[PDB]
Subunit: 120 residues, 2 copies
């Protein structure tokens, strides 16, 4: 009963994390953003180029281009699982690494607070 409320909160918080992630992944398309992350603040990098490439590959998996052989209700089945696995930080293979490693990367990006400022 209260475990119900707790599960509902966890699911909402999970959605919030998904939205944050989508925002970040979208911003990783900007060359200026990639530059800022690879160098860091005072010389201390947030991402290596290697980790950045891992995020690019993951980006393709969770934001797929529309495939004409797939109906709408099918298009995001795999993406939904990729997203869920990342949030859980699963010890499962993806992008030549694991969701656990990808989650650790995302956490460092989130926690760097780079994206707490807006940059237009």
């Amino acid at each position: 009963r209260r475990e119900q409320l707790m599960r509902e909160e966890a699911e909402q918080k999970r959605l919030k994390t998904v939205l944050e992630l989508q925002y970040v992944l979208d911003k990783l398309g900007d060359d200026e953003v990639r530059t800022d992350l690879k160098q860091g603040l005072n010389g201390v990098p947030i991402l290596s180029e290697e980790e950045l490439s891992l995020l690019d590959e993951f980006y393709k998996l969770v934001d797929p281009e529309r495939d004409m052989s797939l109906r709408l209700n099918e298009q995001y089945e795999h993406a939904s699982i990729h997203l869920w696995d990342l949030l859980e930080g699963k010890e499962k293979p993806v992008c030549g690494t694991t969701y656990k490693v990808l989650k650790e990367i995302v956490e460092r990006v989130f926690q760097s607070n780079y994206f707490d400022s807006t940059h237009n």
Copy 2:
């Protein structure tokens, strides 16, 4: 234990629905798409202009512009709740209507199969 697997499946399926919804809401920015939905196939409308405006308002709530007074971890708190409430079809107020009514609108759009074809 199996209720665990069932909850995990439901959460993944919920993410899939979110992704589908985001895709649709994004396409609702195309004037040609709006035209096609308001007229329908053989004269039978998928959306009224009124329902379309309801989706536009909801779009603003779940895809907010980046607000410089908000940190990244705060930006999508409200959006996450709006999304969750829609999925649950709650009898709660939003956009001068309810999430229950909005969910019914989204279902009709999904089920029209308009978005089963790609249109570029």
